[model samples]
Target: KTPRRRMRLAVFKALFQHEFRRDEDLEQILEEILDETYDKKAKEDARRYIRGIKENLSMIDDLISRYLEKWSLNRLSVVDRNVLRLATYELLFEKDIPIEVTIDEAIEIAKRYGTENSGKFVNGILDRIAKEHAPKEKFEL
Candidate 1:
């Protein structure tokens, strides 16, 4: 990874920590993680998505909640849930990142941090999200 991608990964890693930290502690520490980055604006653009997720967490969850067939959101692995957060943010909020890139990166991150089937699981959710949420704008699957 380049320095930029490393920074991006750190941002996602911070979101991943939400599984462990309290909302308040995650709040304070997330600000700290942003400060640790080199390219502030890249992460800065993503900051709004983070803030959006934090502020409208239930809404986003509601959106994600629909696609849950047999499994509940709470049952998602820590890494899978966080991966959903990042990719969902990109799909619904961040205009700069193409959805394909977002989905691919999410799949990659899941494989690295999540279970053996995590890539497939993440891909399925994202594909459904793209179909339901942003149907008009198309990206090659």
Candidate 2:
């Protein structure tokens, strides 16, 4: 995997841990994860992304929860919800990356870390969100 790929996955893992893991010194653990496991060269960038995600979490969850259709946030698996959040963060916040790449990366990561249906599940929500946002972004420009 590329550096950013590792970082993204790390960020997702950190987010998951943020939800379930004890909240003590979370950033330090995330920093150790970047330094020891994910990528040493990527510590700064990875940390920055996680920081961004945390900062905008309310907006990210609210945005994705809207596209979730019938499913409530609690109904979704941890992997699925976190994947959506990170992918949605990338799609909405990290505009420099192509939308396709963001969605595809999320799908792959979800498939690996999530349930058997995770890829299809993530693809469905992200596609709708993207479709809705794309034209609106153009119109607003």
Candidate 3:
């Protein structure tokens, strides 16, 4: 309902498109998925996440890889991986938001767009990431 929530879904969708439409410009792909109802600030917020995810993908993937247990980043479903990308960026770089907010938003998006186990998988990996990398007081969940 809020701008960040709406933009987050847009971010996830844009990242999903990034995998299949690698030839497409990331800005254009995001613009295509972003709803017309969003105002300038929301659009900017969406752009920030998209660009951040793009700029820091290798780091994000490397961080994700460490917590995956037996799983590999490439082995994750497209939906799951993108969800992690968004949340991981928020958790690690965007400290204005509480850690629980970032993880729950990712889990919700994963369940809606990913496989049945995606919510659990996202939650599991993000929890580990937060515990190891986040401030102790930042996440209460």
Candidate 4:
């Protein structure tokens, strides 16, 4: 993966941790990581992701609520919920990323870090949301 792509993955991990584990300011965390990693561009990208999630949080929640069968967002494991939030943010708002890539990355992360069922759950919800909410062109691929 390219450095930028790796940075995105790192940002997602950091943001997920922030959301699920600690409530510290995201900007501070990003700044701290950027200092350690010494990648200014990665820092910017991470900032964009953090801000994206903050700005479109309600829409993200709405998408989850619409497709999640029985579990409320709160009822989900913290890792699962955070993964969905990050993936949904990428799917619905980040136009540059291919929809499949976003979904695939989310599922991969969920499989590694979330509950046993989280990969399938994340996949199902993201697929439904992408079909319903993503641009028609994105759905075509």
Off by over 4 Å in 4: 1-5, 20-23, 36-38
Tens digits of per-residue lDDT, candidate 2, 1-141, equal 347887788888887787777655557657756656554557776777788878887888888878777778768888999898888877776656777788899999999988898899999899888777643453232
lDDT of 4 by residue, 91-116 (tens): 77777788989988889888888888
Backbone clash total for model 1 is 0
What are the Cα lDDT values of the candidates? 0.74, 0.78, 0.86, 0.78
Best by TM-score: 3
Candidate 2: where is the Cα deviation over 4 Å? Answer: 36-41, 134-141
* TM-scores for candidates 1 onward, in order: 0.83, 0.84, 0.91, 0.84
**Residue 31 alpha-carbon offset, candidate 1, angstroms:** 2.9
Q: How far is 36's C-alpha from truth in model 4 (Å)?
A: 4.5
Writing each residue's lDDT as its tens digit, candidate 1 over 1-141 gives 126455557657777876677645555656767654346665665466567768867777788778878678889888888788777866876555677788888898999988999999989999899777863554533
Question: What range of 10 consecutive residues in model 2 has the weakest lDDT sum?
Answer: 132-141
Measured by lDDT, the strongest candidate is: 3
Name the candidate, 3 or 4, with the larger TM-score value.
3
